[PDB]
């Protein structure tokens, strides 16, 4: 019942968009449709083109285009969406439709948090719907003739909850006949932004060694691939507990963690959800991929894990050739619930 | 003289 409207600086070009967030359902993406309002008296034989561009910016400034789609809206050369038909009826004869199809396996709108050193433009993946009027596509795009609207490709939490994330490891030591066992689990696989994460830790210490600390952290993994392969680690939540497990003793505790942006504002490169202009966006949602594809995507891939690490007391005849850190990792999903 | 920002309009 409402649409977005942005006009050209001269007022001779207006692009209508029904929404600014287009949901990726892994299999397919929401089609970017719209209506552009032209005036042939101003155009005088020019053509109105609409462009959808997915770019990886740096704001160096290594700006590259990951997907470009261009459509000639005026003069006309897809079936009309009901919204497009209604917009044409509202506007008139000089309103012309455009429609884009975002191919799958493209990045979602992800902004990397800038460091305090630099105050430049945003770095990450963003989409843009640009409408301009020019005689040919080889001509440069003019500011007075063009309208740029930033759109976002988003993903929401899966409707069906996944299997409970569990991990368990075990260590054997030279002077202990029985092993040290660590079990960690989360109460659910899909978490929402701002909601707490409960980590159920079960430590069965049958060794002669005692664990000094249990460090539990939520870490964000950003897979950034433009020129190289690079996975970046960022602990978005931590809990250093002084809980000690005595030798030949067991321990069971539940830890609660909540990742949020207030205490993570000094971490450069931290992935955030796509911004429209400069507003506060929460930590980046987990990107949903195909079940098994083993496919690498040009862009930023965000995933989260909970690392439960035991700090075992040092010493012994064997020495430093043993595990001082017995850790497990619990992959979970941090997303937004589907609206309504 | 500023750049026309994004607004909305009723689709009727």
């Amino acid at each position: 019942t409402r649409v977005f409207k942005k006009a050209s600086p001269n007022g001779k070009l207006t692009v209508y968009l029904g929404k600014r967030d287009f949901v990726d359902h892994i299999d397919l993406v929401d089609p970017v449709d719209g209506v552009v309002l032209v005036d042939p008296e101003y155009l005088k034989e020019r053509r109105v083109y609409v462009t959808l561009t997915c770019a990886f910016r740096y704001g160096l400034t290594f700006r590259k285009d990951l997907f470009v789609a261009n459509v000639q809206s005026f003069p006309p050369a897809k079936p009309l969406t009901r919204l497009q038909e209604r917009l044409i009826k509202k506007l008139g004869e000089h309103a012309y439709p455009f429609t884009f199809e975002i191919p799958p396996n493209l990045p979602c709108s992800v902004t990397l948090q800038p460091g305090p050193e630099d105050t430049g433009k945003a770095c990450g993946v963003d989409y843009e719907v640009k409408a301009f009027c020019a005689e040919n596509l080889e001509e440069k795009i003019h500011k007075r003739n063009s309208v740029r609207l930033v759109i976002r490709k988003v993903q929401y939490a899966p409707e069906r909850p996944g299997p409970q994330p569990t991990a368990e490891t075990t260590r054997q030591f030279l002077m202990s006949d029985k092993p040290l066992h660590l079990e960690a689990s989360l109460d659910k696989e899909i978490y929402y932004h701002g909601e707490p994460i409960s980590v159920n830790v079960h430590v069965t210490n049958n060794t002669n060694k005692t664990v000094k600390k249990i460090k539990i952290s939520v870490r964000q993994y950003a897979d950034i691939c433009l020129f190289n392969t690079a996975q970046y680690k960022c602990p978005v939540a931590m809990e250093e507990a002084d809980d000690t497990v005595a030798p030949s003793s067991t321990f069971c505790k539940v830890y609660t963690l909540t990742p949020f942006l207030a205490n993570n504002r000094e971490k450069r490169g931290l992935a955030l959800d796509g911004k429209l202009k400069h507003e506060d966006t929460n930590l980046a949602s987990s990107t949903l991929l195909r079940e098994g594809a083993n496919r690498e995507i040009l862009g930023i891939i965000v995933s989260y894990k909970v690392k439960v690490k035991l700090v075992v007391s040092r010493g012994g005849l064997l020495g430093d050739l043993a595990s001082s850190d017995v850790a497990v990792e619990l992959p979970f999903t941090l997303m937004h619930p589907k609206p309504k | 003289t500023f750049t026309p920002s994004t607004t909305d309009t009723s689709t009727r």
Partner: antibody
Amino acid sequence: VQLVESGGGLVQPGGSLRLSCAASGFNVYSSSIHWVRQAPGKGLEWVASISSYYGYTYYADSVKGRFTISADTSKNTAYLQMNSLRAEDTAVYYCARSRQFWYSGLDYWGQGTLVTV
Amino acid sequence: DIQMTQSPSSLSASVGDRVTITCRASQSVSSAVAWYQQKPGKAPKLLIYSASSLYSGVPSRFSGSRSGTDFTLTISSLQPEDFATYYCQQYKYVPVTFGQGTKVEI
């Protein structure tokens, strides 16, 4: 999901009062906590709001400097420090909740505590 | 700031009568407008958000509409439990500003 208040009472002009909002049934990082006063016989007036997810606090121009909104994220409780109070600040102070993602009105309200001054 | 000029200050209607309460925003607050019901001596109750979406649990007789900067709360049928002061909030810009309320009586 319930909000309960405590801390409203009679104070003298220039005095200080602390209002607490024991939030239960929701998380301080998935919600935003707001304070909305209401002078007797008048309409609602927003005074202060806190977002624990972003660590940002907002105040009305009438209470800037004098008032301070806080949150005890461990106890799921928010506090409003009403310093340098004035006679015009007498009202029924309401603690309200809004979704953090995203604001869709003040869906949950407290019962309200009168601050007389 | 932004002023939400709510009209009328108060109206009277019978049971089953149609009541329309109008809100006007000084600036363009988009659809970020909420409506509240506050019976005397109690806390306000959220009715509408986004200027048209009925809050969960609210009876269907409450409807919200927008026309540019003009927002309207309509009560199709006026049951006896619908007599209260109705408030209009915009939450598009800090500070949040409310309407002056509209008392509805017999």
